[PDB]
Amino acid sequence: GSMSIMDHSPTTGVVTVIVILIAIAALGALILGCWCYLRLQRISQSEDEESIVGDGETKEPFLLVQYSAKGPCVERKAKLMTPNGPEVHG
């Protein structure tokens, strides 16, 4: 039974996914503002945003899981090989 508010509701889950979503959006914004959501991923000087329209939701849900898996796989291999922290390097 809920106690006036909704303690017996998945509010902790809705808040957890909203915080994670807010964090993902904030991270995406940080990458869009600091690297135009491109960060020199290829020849550059022509490529557009690679995450939602450049690659992610442009066609079919395939790019979604593709970016959902490679995004972190690339970000991890990029952070493991390079500093990826503009506070000290590119």
**Domain regions of the chain by residue span:** 1-90
The torsion angles phi and psi of 23, rounded to 5 degrees, stand at -65, -45
Q: Which residues of 32-70 are buried (b: 16+ CB within 10 A; e: fewer)?
A: eeeeebbbeeeeeeeeeebbeebbbeeeeeebeeebeee
Q: How was this structure determined?
A: NMR
- 45 DSSP 8-state letter: S
CATH class as words, domain 1-90: few secondary structures
